[model samples]
Target: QCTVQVRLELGHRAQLRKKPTTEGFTHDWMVFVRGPEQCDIQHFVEKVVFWLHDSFPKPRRVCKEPPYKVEESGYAGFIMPIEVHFKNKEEPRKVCFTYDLFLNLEGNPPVNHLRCEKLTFNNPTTEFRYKLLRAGGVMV
Candidate 1:
């Protein structure tokens, strides 16, 4: 399938987490694609099905129609957009796909601060390619 016209930059999650528990707060970002013919869209419908099978097979198959919480996944690619949670409903009514999602790791800055001068830095030094072959006794 072709790359959907929907596109987003790689590092869209520019905000860093300032607190513990990333719940409800996300450094992750989503690219969105919306269209009525979701199945006709490239790799669009299959994406949701893939998540159903791959992400939450038990819950996905358990119900006739599951809510977005059961239906959405960030693993196979960002197939869902944040707006869907607020506005869009009637799935098969129209679908939106988003990819190039940036999910910032949930690593809050550790509690330890040192003055700049207190820190010791070790340089990695030069990146050597290879030792040149020695010809004669002379240092070349």
Candidate 2:
């Protein structure tokens, strides 16, 4: 079975202030990996179609050099889990998953933020990794 691992990366200046205190933009830059088609378990460089969401606009999709980069700006705030449906070529309507999105901000006078993630699996059955239930077990 193929496993998926979503990684979220936020820029250093990726933040915005809701209520104006000192200064900050109303939007923060974000990138999302769409499709991410893979031929095998170890090869996840499959096309990686980067698309735009209704909430996140102005997207840029490409395969090389920052593959599947969502070169767009999104509102700096709490976002509900997004449902991503894969094309028929990959799993062929086998299953779907949700991608959780969150913006973490920190600062005194001003705030800098980073995008964090919480993924949900349809079913727990894969070779991801886990230490056995033992004192000296291995992590596989």
Candidate 3:
């Protein structure tokens, strides 16, 4: 088995515009996926998809490269669905998860939230094993 680490993060800040908008949007935020510090996930991750709120046009966002993230502006918070796709044929097509996006304008203007996950591949294929090893994954 091999284990790889991935992190999901969100950062938000209150809107700075003085003019009030009709939508009543209060904050700008961003959500992203990345490998743990110093680790490269690109070797195994093919792409990432973020499902934003219905209010957004083209809510289904796709990131095909590093710094995989989606940014938007909104007043309220909601749960977001994220899908991570793998490059190795032996691995599952993708992994799905949810992230709770909340806005706290009282504490700090820009608040950051993070979630870490470990993906384990049992009896990984030879090609995938080498790819994992090259990407800093650990054998178990």
Each model's lDDT comes to: 0.24, 0.35, 0.73
lDDT of model 2 at position 122: 31
lDDT minimum window of 10 residues, candidate 3: 8-17
Number of backbone clashes in candidate 3: 0
Candidate 1 stretches with Cα past 4 Å from truth are: 1-14, 22-28, 36-100, 104-140
Q: lDDT by residue for model 1 over 78-122, one digit each (tens)? A: 432322221112232233233233344446432221111111112
lDDT of 1: 0.24
Residue-wise C-alpha lDDT for candidate 3, range 40-125, written one tens digit per residue? 77887788988998988999999999888887877777888899888778547788988787776544556676777778777768
Q: Which candidate would rank higher by lDDT, 1 or 3?
A: 3
RMSD of 1: 22.2
TM, every model:
0.20, 0.34, 0.82
lDDT of 3 at 62: 95
Tell me which residue pairs clash in candidate 2: none
Judging by TM-score against the true structure, name the best candidate: 3
